[PDB]
Structures are given as C-alpha cells and as structure tokens.
Design a protein around this ligand. Sequence first.
Ligand SMILES: Nc1ncnc2c1ncn2[C@@H]1O[C@H](COP(=O)(O)OP(=O)(O)OP(=O)(O)O)[C@@H](O)[C@H]1O
Lengths: 806, 626, 49
Amino acid sequence: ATDMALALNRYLCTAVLPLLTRCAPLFAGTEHHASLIDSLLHTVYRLSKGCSLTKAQRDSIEVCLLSICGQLRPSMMQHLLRRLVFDVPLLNEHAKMPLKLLTNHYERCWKYYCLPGGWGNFGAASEEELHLSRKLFWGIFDALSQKKYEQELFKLALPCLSAVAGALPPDYMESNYVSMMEKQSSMDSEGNFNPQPVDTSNITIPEKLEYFINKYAEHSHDKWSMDKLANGWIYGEIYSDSSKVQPLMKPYKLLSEKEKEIYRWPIKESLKTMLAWGWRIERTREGDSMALYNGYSPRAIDMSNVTLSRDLHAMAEMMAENYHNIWAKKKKMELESKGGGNHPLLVPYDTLTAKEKAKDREKAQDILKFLQINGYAVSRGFKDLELDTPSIEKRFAYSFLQQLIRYVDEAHQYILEFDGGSRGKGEHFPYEQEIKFFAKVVLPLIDQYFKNHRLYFLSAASRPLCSGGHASNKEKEMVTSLFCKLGVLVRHRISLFGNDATSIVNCLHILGQTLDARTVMKTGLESVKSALRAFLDNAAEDLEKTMENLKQGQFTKGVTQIINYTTVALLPMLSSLFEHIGQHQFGEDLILEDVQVSCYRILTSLYALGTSKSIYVERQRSALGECLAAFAGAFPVAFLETHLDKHNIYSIYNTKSSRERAALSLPTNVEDVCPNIPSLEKLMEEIVELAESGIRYTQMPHVMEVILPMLCSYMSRWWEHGPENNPERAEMCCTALNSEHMNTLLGNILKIIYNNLGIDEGAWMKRLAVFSQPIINKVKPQLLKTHFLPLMEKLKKKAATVVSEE
Amino acid sequence: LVEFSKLPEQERNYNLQMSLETLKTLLALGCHVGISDEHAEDKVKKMKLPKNYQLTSGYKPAPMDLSFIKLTPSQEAMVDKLAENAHNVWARDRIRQGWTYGIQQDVKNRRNPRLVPYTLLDDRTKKSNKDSLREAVRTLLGYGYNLEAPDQDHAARAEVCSGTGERFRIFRAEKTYAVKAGRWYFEFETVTAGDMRVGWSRPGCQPDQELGSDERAFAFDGFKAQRWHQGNEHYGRSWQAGDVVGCMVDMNEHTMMFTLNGEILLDDSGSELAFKDFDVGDGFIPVCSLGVAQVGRMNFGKDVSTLKYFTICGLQEGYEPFAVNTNRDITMWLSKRLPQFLQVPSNHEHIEVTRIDGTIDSSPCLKVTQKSFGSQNSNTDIMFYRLSMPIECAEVFSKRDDYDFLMQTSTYYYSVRIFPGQEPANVWVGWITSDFHQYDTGFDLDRVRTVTVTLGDEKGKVHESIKRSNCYMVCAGESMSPGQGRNNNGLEIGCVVDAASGLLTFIANGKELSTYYQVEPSTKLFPAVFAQATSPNVFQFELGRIKNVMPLSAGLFKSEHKNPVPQCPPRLHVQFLSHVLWSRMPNQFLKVDVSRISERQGWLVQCLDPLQFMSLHIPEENRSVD
Amino acid sequence: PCYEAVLPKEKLKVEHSREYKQERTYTRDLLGPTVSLTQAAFTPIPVDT
Ligand SMILES: Nc1ncnc2c1ncn2[C@@H]1O[C@H](COP(=O)(O)OP(=O)(O)OP(=O)(O)O)[C@@H](O)[C@H]1O
C-alpha cells in the first residue's frame, strides 16, 4: 500500500523489465554468475507474487520472466523450480504464469529430460530434479482432478501436464530414498522465509570431536592474532582500542577458559549442527598418531589451494543455508523487537547474493577442510536402507499407468452411472464435472504420452530406444487393458460425450498404433487376454448387427445412431487396429483362437458392405475401402487359396485341429465360410475383363474403391508368402502366387487410369495411388520403364484437364 | 551302486551337501521357491523299469514319470547356468588341489584338458552332466515344488572391453595430399559392422578426439546412421558387413555426399547432400574411424578398376578417384598407440606451466597449475610430467660449501614443492628413463616395469644381479613421515643423483628417505613428477642447490658444467605424457614367409630381402624417428 | 612344451607379432582396437552361497 512501492513497480516494469526482456539473448553464458542469476529469478518470482500489481505490470513480469527463462539454463532454474512446483498446487489465477513457465520450460528442455544423455553440454538432470518434477506432475494432475471445471485453467494446464509427461523418462525408477530432510524455509507456505533451524542441544560431543575442537581453537586464535597485529594490535597487557595493544598473543592453552567460551562456543554450535542432521565423521589413524606426536611451529596452515568434494559441497551449501537461517532468525527477533521497519536482507539464503554468501562459504570450507585434514571421513549419516530397483512398479510410467488405469476404471464407473441416468431424466450430474476433467485432460495426456514415448511402449528389450527404457510386459498388457477400457468408454457413448467422441477415436487410433500386443499374447495375464478377445468380438458383433440391420432397415432412430457410431468410429477404429497389426506384422498371433473364425465372419460382412450399394455406402466408400485393405493386411491366411488352405500350418484348423469346431454348427471349411467372396482366379478374370472393358468409375465404383485396394493389400502382404519371393518351400507352404499376378494387375490399373483419363475422375484415383504406392515399390524398375513411362505420357497428355495425379 | 545306508557315508555326505549347494545356487540365481500343495508330495508318483534296470535299492526304478515332467523354457535357460556354477565349483576344488590344464590328461604331471571353461568344454561330458542336472532340476519341480523361475535378465555388457584405454584408431592420408579444389571420390569397404566412421577430415584433426565430434572432421557414423560434424544428425542407412561406403566431395560448390553399396544416402529431409556448406580452409584428406574389433579397408582408387561402385555412381557424375594419377602409393597416417612426452602447449585446456625466474634468494622454478579446477570437465586423472633434458650417468662406475668439493663432485640435485593444499599421496617424485611410455589412470609404484638380469659364474652362482627399470620415483604420502603438512615449508622432496656411482637418494624436508635406487652406467635419467590434480596449484620444480651437490643445470647442460649457480635456460621446459600424436605406416614392409614344413620340421620363418630406413635421432630426448 | 598351451579349438600358427604386414594397399586390413584377451586365463568363479 505504500506509494513508493507503486512508483518503484512502475519504474521496474517500464524500464528494467522491458530492457531485460530485450536483453534475452545476452543471458546465455551465466555459469560464472549462476548464483546471482538464480537470485534474480527468485526475486522476479517474488515480484510476480505481488498483489498490488496492475494488469499491465503483471503482464510485463510474465513476458520478462518467460523470455529470460526461455534461453537461460535449467541447471540454474532448479532453484526456482522447487518453489514453482511448491506454489502451483494452490492453482489460483495468480499461478497461471508459473504454470505457463513450467509448460514451455519442459518443452524447451525436452531432450535434456527425456533423453538420458540430453544435450552434451547440458548433460542430464541430477534425477533429484526428476524426483521434484515427478512430484510436480502428480501434484498438478491430482489437484486438477479434484479442481472444479474452469475452462481456461484446463486449457492452460493440459499443455503443462503433457510437457511434464513427455520430459519425464517413462522408465524412471522411483528413487529408493524418497526425499526428506528439506529445510523448513522450503516447507514454509507463506513467502518461504521462516528460517527455523533444527534442535541440536540434545546431541553431545565424542572424544574424537573434543580433540577436534582442540588445536582448532588454537588455529583460529593464531590466525585471528595475525589479523589483530595486522589491524595494529600490540602485545600490551592493557586492552586499549586506540593504542591497539592487547595481551592476547599468548597461545590458546595459555588463554583462560572464559575467553575460550564464546570464542569456542560457536564452534560447539557449528559442530552440533554438523551432527544435528546426523552426518557421521570417521577419523583416520594419523588423527591420533599426531596426538601421540604431541622442529614444530604453532602457526596456521592455509587451506586455499585444497578443494573439497562435490557432494560435500552440496551438503555444505545447505549448511551455509542453516547458518544463514539462524542469522535470519536472530535478525527476525530483532525486527519484532524494534517493532518497526523492514530488513534489507531478510531474504532466504537462495535469494541472497554470492558476495555476502562468501562468509558462509568460507566458514563451511574451513571447517570441512580442517576435519578432513584431521582425518574425519565426512559423509551422510546413513546410506540407503535397501534397493527395490527390481520393483518395476516404481518406474514412473508404471506407477503413472497404475493411477491411469485407476482413473480409467473410475471413468468407466461414471459412464455406468451416466448410462443409468440416461434411463433417468437427468443428463446433469456433479460427476459430469469429473468426466470433463477426464475427457479434456486424461485423454489428451494419454495422447501426448503415447505420441512421445510410443517407442518406449514398443520398447520391450527388443531394442526400441536401444539406450534402454523398455516397457515391461506387464506394463504392456495393462496398456492393452487400457485400450479395451477406452473402447468400452466409447462403446456407443457419443451423446454422453460432448460430441467429443472424435477425441476418444483419435486416442484409440494412436493407442492402436502403439499397441504391441504380440508380446502380451506370448506372455501376459490371461484375464486381460480374454478381455482383448472380448473387445475384438464385441466390436465385431456390433459391426455385423449394424450392417445387417442397415439392410433389413435399408428401406425407411436409436439403431440408426448406433449404425452411425459404428461406421463413423468403430469401423475406423478397428481399421486402424488392423493397420498397425499389418505394419508391425504383429497380431497374427492375436488372431489364433476363435479370432480367426470371427475374422472370417467380419470378412464376409465387409465383403457384403463392399459389394452392396447405398448412398451412405458411397459416403463411407473410402472408409470401407481402407477397412477392407486393413483387414486383408491384418489377416493371416491366403483367403483366396481355398483349394489349398488346409495346407496352411498356421491356420487354427491345422493348429488346434478342427474336431470341436466340426462338432459345433460351423462350416469349418474356408470355402464353406466364404462362398460369396470370389476366388483368386475368377476374381482376377472378372477385374481384368472389367479393366479391358474400360468402363468409368461410376458404373462399378465398388470394385475400384474396396476390392482393388484390398487386392493391393493382399498382394503386398502375400508377396513374400508367394514363391514369387521364395520358390523354396513350394508345397511346403499354403500360399502360391507369382509376380506376374500383380504385374498384370498393375497393367490393368494403368489401363483403368487411361480409360478414366477422359471423364468421371475423383479423389478415388489419388487414394488408390496411395494404396498402390507399396505395390509400385515391389514392382521392378525394368517394369517401371516401358510399362509406366507411356502411362506417364498419358498422365501429361491431358493438358486441358486440371485434376492432379502422379 | 547301493542304498543310501550301505553307500559309503562320506560319499553320502558329499551327495547331500552338493544337493544343498545346488539349491543354494538356485537361491543365488533368484529362483522363487514354492510348492502347489504338500498333498502332491504326500502322494508320490511311481513307475517301474525292467529287471535289468532294477537295483538293490528298494526305491522305484524310475518313480518320477518322465511323461508329465515337461520342463519350462525359463527352467532350461536356468539349467545351463546351474551347470556353469557346478563346473566352477568343480574346477575351483581342482585348483585348491593344485591341478592345471594340460591338453593331454596327466597324473604324474597331474594335468587335465577338461579343466577348461564350460563354454569351451567337451560337448559329450558337458551334455552328460547337463542332462543329469536337467533330470534333477526337473524332478525338483515334479516333486511338488513348482519352483518359480527368476527374472530372465536381458541386460548385456554389449562388449565395451577395449585393450588399454584407447577406444578407436583414426586412419588418414598424409597432410600434403589435401585437396583444396576439384571433385574427388574414394571407397571404404567395411569388413565388419560396428562403430566405424568415415569421411573427410581437415589437417588439424586430432587422433584422440572422436571423428567428427569437433569441427575438424566430417564423417558418417553408419552404425547409428548419423552424420558427425560439431555434433550428430540423422542421415543415411546403417550398413551391413561387406557394405562399401563411397566418400564423395566436390570442393567447387562446397558439398559432400555419401553412398552405400552404390545407392546414394539421403538426409532426414529429401536433400541428397550430406553437408551443404563448408569452408575450403587448408583442404581435406580422407579419414576413417575404427572402433573396437573393427576391420575396414580404404580404396583410394590407385587402380580405378579396383573401385567397384565408382562406375555405377561417381564416374558418370564426373568425380575423380583420390589417387587419380599418382605414381606412388599414398602414405597413410594413423593414431599413435604408445603415449609420448611433448611440451605442454600454451593453449592446453587443463595444464598451465609458468616459469619463475630465479632471484638472488630464490631458486629458478617451474610450477604446474591446473586452470579448469573447480569447474566442469576438471581432470582428476593422473598426469605425468617430466623435464626436457636427461642427466647422464657415468660411462663406467668408479670402483658454507667446499668449493673444491663442488668442483670435483658429480652429484646433481633438484627438488619438488608440493603446494600446500595439494594432497601428497597423489604426487610421486623422482626420475624416469626414456622408455617410460605406459599410461594409466591409476599408477602405483608396485606396477613399474622391472627386470633383474642375473649374470652368473660358470657353476651358476649369482655373482652379479642388476635391477633395471624405467621408473625410479617415490611418493610423497610415505615421505610425509613426521606427519602433518607445514605451510612455512610445504612438502619438499629433493632428489640427489650421483652420476659417478648411479646412486639415487631422496631427501624429504631435510630427512634422507630410506628408499634408494641403483642404476646402470650410462643411464638416461629425466626428472619427473606424477601428480593428480587436487588443487589449482599442484607442485613446482626447484633447481636449487643443497650443500656439496651440484645444481641440475650443471648436469643437464655442458657449458655450465662448472657453474655452481643454479640456472634454468629456456631449453629446459616441462613436458607431459600425451596421446595426441600421429604415426606413419611404412610404404613397404619386410618379406616374411611362414609355413609348416612338416610335423617334424616345425614352422619356418625366412626373410631374404633387405629394407632400410633413415633414422633421425633427437639427441636430447634419447628418441629416434624415421 | 609350448604346443600344450594351444586352446582346444584353436590351431597353433606363427604370425606377425604386429598387426600390419606387407600386402596390397586396398586389401590392407585396417584393424581397430582389439578386445582385451582376459578370457584367455580361466579362473573358476563359483557363486557365493
Ligand atoms: N556327490 C559327490 N560330490 C563330491 N564328491 C563326491 C561325491 N560323491 C563322491 N565323492 C567323492 O569324490 C571323489 C570322486 O572320485 P573321482 O576319482 O571321480 O574324483 P576326481 O578325479 O577328483 O574328479 P571327479 O569327481 O570330478 O570325476 C571320491 O573321493 C568320492 O568319495
């Protein structure tokens, strides 16, 4: 409320902050003065915690701090980060700038955290920073879950959470020693300036430590006597200040005990702090050998050249903190004793500046160097109790996915309650607030996590991320159970969603791409295995019931919206499922046990869709085509080899015999199962005669939109299964196919291109070209030349046309 | 062959305790132990074999049905390590006995060819004990105790072992063959796949630094499919064994290209140029980096027909082989293996040597200080320092201060002041010979190379034993005998050499140390200090003079042979043992013919063609180079 | 006798103590650093139980 403070805020925000913002490039090299830049960061954050800031001033601090941190290095930001992570869970509108700062900070230091090597000059985090970042992630995620729905707050936090998740290594094993023993000033919620020291009068001196304070008081006495005579003090028995005479040049042994106290009592206090946190120091044997030793000179050794260890430096840093905190306590009692005014240096030790810190540094170094010269082996009071590193649960990804399955099962229950309330009158629930959080955060957080660490989930020690970071097999079936649960959550739940079901769809597509369920199939939890089978069977039976009821109801709306859901999300979702199955070549083991039969029946259904015609089929023609192509890519059996499919050793009829299937009311023959689907031979003869006829697309669009694409998927997958690739194992394998097959088929494709050059046209050429790209990769360049170069000439001879094509 | 009771009870004890040690091994492997139910054991399974397979023991001929014990893959994967440990115990007991491996089995010499690692052991014997162990472990679970397999650990060492500290060797053409203009092509045949890098390097490339890590080199790390210049990008495809990479440069437009088995390598983006813009500078020369156990071949296109991918790619574009019209083969230069002593550079990242002139009251001094201490990249490794000139021992060993004694004497003195704050046990002081070319991160006085020639009389008496070593030094840790360290007098080890007698005596803070060295006549002795950086200031040489001893300059130099005043002429300078030096492969090696004549005649080695090289001998360093 | 020290799978052969010999320049096998042959000496290492 003071007026100058307003004037000084105006001055800073108008002159200094804009100037330092324009100075952003200059702040790069700062390892020299990291301490003062850290103090600058801390004080800028303190000002950003200014209540009396105008909106313009607040924006000025926001821009300045973000710009400075943008280039400056996280090996300095950690100090401000521990306060940022501590004050963000309040989640007030005041902390939005800190939230943005963390958001873009993790993004700009992405590779430092995610990559174990990071930037070579930068290195890697000390993993205590990783611990605090993990605590930050959990704190924001939870407090956001309990937090009431604020639109802007979730718009801001979601990028922050995604950035933190991407930065944190998924395979980060939680440190066996969780971090305690923090200073009370950090735990100090208000301002973080309460400098309470620890209680240390209880502990007592050992005999080795009293021998240590012996001759150390002698060292300090002699050096301070040198200082006295430098100041001018002379060996005059009278203590005269102006005369600079003092009888105190006598040795510490000759000193009286009264002068020893207060001279040595703070040494006792420093040692009591030494033992207060519990560090134990072990003296070597020269320490008492010199005691037995008793040309010698009572003059002080200089400890300038020697240096201490880096971990000991870290411990000595918080010792500089504790001594400054006692100092700040005494000046606090001074401030409420005076009852008026403020202290220029009431700021915490980290907020302090290096030059005045130098006294604490020299104190810590002199005491530690003295003890290590005397032989006391100083280290932490106790080593880590036990290592649970075999517990893969403490992996950050594993624990996070545990909690993520927790929230996903919760959301499944909330959808069950919402289904019960859809039968009820009310679509309004308090739980709708929590589902807003789920859909708007967890779903995109899943999205970003799998986009960033998809190779980690593919990492199962099969050398994705050759540096390491494998997703454990159990982590992987719980990933697949998450996939199944999201399927259930999206199971005909469009209206329960805010029409945001498209977001869940995209989540399933990318999660499907990240699926590595083959290793789960080989080794995994059988209940989750059955859950996956039930998933792909429920989705199947839904698609067939919809595709029949769309024909028995072709002549004409709950079933209608069910059909819409199926053909808009489920069919795309399973199409992407089948896509990643094909591209990984992983999932052939998924389709073994009744999955094969369900897939033959799905093939019959998709064939019926492709052959059938309706306006909505024309709407979904590209979707149907890519669905058929995806199925053919995923499917393990040459389905047009029906004459010899009994030779397919991998087919379940060969594998688990057929005895029980034959007993049950099933055709149990591939030819019996798929009579509507044509055979290989008549299929090529029909499509070849159609091509040489050269009709437009519009007469028989279905062929070119579904089967020729699905025939393309067929050639692409079964090229290596054909003796065209391996003439060996002939009649030792089911699939017999020749390169001339798809050679004639591509010649046919070119002829259709020629006869459709004149008229008709559409995006269907471009999409079939996309599907034909792998086939034109398989084709021979000698075939390319000759068989396509005239077709390139035909692609250019329609100069009048404007349609785009290869 | 009988029941447990009649079977001798000490053999019973050995069988029992080996079963105990076997299950202890299962525990040490982390195999969880559990039984489905005690009833499954209270009802043991039985089947019987014919009379020939019957025995005195009433126990069933094969109680455990071989049918329903199908061992599980993790358990078979465990049995082989169990056999590993069993053979380790066997061989360790055999060594306790005192046996040793002999390719023929012996008892009087008591040798066993089977006393070898299991991976190299006889297949028949290993499978015999292995099937015994398989059967035992399988019955161990079939006995009701469904033992839970431990984790199938995937972690592998990935073969990080390398001979000595050296990790890779850099092969490059001579600097004079650098190209400043034109367009050039050479091939690099990768015999083995691995951490190989190949490309074009500036003449300033250092052998020790990784190829392309700095700005000097431009390489293609095909092992990880990465470019390498001032950092790594992603480019090209990884090679297979036998793949050939053509390194391809056109200095006119400052471009670089790489190909693999003829096909061009492609950037992350669609561009085909590996490196888009660089500087001509002082030219480029071919270079390759070869990792551990990596074999590669350069083909500089001496005979253009030898290049095999040049025709399909490189010739039509207009590129020229590197040895397009050279009459004689290009001389390759590679990274030197043995470290050598070279003068400390002024721009050295870590060592700073400042020369202190000698005043009237202060001896001339050279101090070694480390610049980067307390900062990141500070070197805690031991570094080896030596003076540039050696003291000469006498040709034949004879068998205030008195000016006459100083003029007739041949003892020389230098001393080293470990700076207060530099830890004494990490600093060694004394003399080394010219042959000290061994580098170690941790150097111990016990490791020094020594040999003792024992010339004997006719009947074999040891009438003369001569110790020979390259390192004659002592540590300050045991020289700090009185204890503690004086600021007024920092730890001051002095070295006294008697060139007339070859006796090396060390004095510490005015006290003569017990350690003394006797050297051979005509021995080159370099003053040397080995130190580990524990402070910004480590040590300094003192060229002073103690009573009745000549100064070091009187021994090192010839003109000052009779000048008792200490001197530090500019020729004397501190050198340090370093790896940054190249070496030259001779253009021609000796004809050596090796063959086994027969079983009787052994192996023949014959060389009949002479080769000679002019040797340049640096007199002060006792070193010779081609 | 020295022939007794040959490893059972290996064949004794007299060879250039140094890696490089005289041969054609493009056929010159440039050998990188080798792996230390610590495995030559077989010291049994029983596990501690
Ligand atoms: N299960 C057992 N484990 C260890 N020692 C045993 C066991 N059963 C018997 N022994 C004792 O070990 C010795 C085996 O004699 P043997 O001649 O086979 O020994 P070896 O030549 O040292 O080598 P190895 O036992 O490996 O064939 C005998 O002294 C025997 O009493």
